[PDB]
Nucleic acid binder design. Sequence first.
RNA 1: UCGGGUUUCUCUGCGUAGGAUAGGUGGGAGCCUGCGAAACUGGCCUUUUGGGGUCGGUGGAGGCAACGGUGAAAUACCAC
Length: 224
Amino acid sequence: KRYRALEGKVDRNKQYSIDEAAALVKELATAKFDETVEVHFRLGIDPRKSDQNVRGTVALPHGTGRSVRVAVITKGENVQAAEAAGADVVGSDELIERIAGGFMDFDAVVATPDMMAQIGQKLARLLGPRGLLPNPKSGTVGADVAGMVRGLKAGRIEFRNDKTGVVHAPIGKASFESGNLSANYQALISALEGAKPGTAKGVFLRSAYLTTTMGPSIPLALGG
RNA sequence: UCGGGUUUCUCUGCGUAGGAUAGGUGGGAGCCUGCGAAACUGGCCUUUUGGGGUCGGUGGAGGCAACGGUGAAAUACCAC
């Protein structure tokens, strides 16, 4: 079991907001190693339509407890600008062979301006149906693979949505403070309640709950 | 007896590849001795291709997820 001294401090009948929960959230965690805590939401608009699936990014403020993933595919004076910085598996068009021979655990498979045709003529029968490619309106097109890859650097990207009514983007790590468990939670209601395409319902924010490596749940209030 | 809601206790969920229904994000590798995992024979909830729970004879007690296998995402340990 080992449920006590962590569920006892918890009542699913009260509320712990933005400046009271983030200081009683690293608590609700006393398990083994490091212990991050989730932050739940509910896009329960009309979840069985293809015009209520969130297909947009999030950009965490500070630095998480990770690094950066951007599988660049460049050539020339674009090789010493993505290898001498902090990207991932950077080189030339050899990356086609590194993203077609069985290794697609990468993220933004970047490219060069004149060399989108390399990701478009060979890996359009492969990478085509991934939607993980550099578009001229998405995030990383042109010669902005240094400062808008700093949107894949200065922000753990990711983008997903489901079919029941549960949506919960995480904060990052509890390796911070209580003004940084709610300053990374100031990038969750600052990057997930911009999801109203064309049809909606009444009242989006219904409540809020929690999650760790041993729970439980003190309902996060919503307001000022 | 019919109406529905709430709340607790309970489970289905193979259009695709995956040995074997993966149901989601984080702590994604450890503790678990404090709340429904193997598949022989006249089974129901899913409907006589295989798959959790089986009434009874039959009676090796420690383990797995995984690297691999593999999809925009994987099959277990705590949970919304």
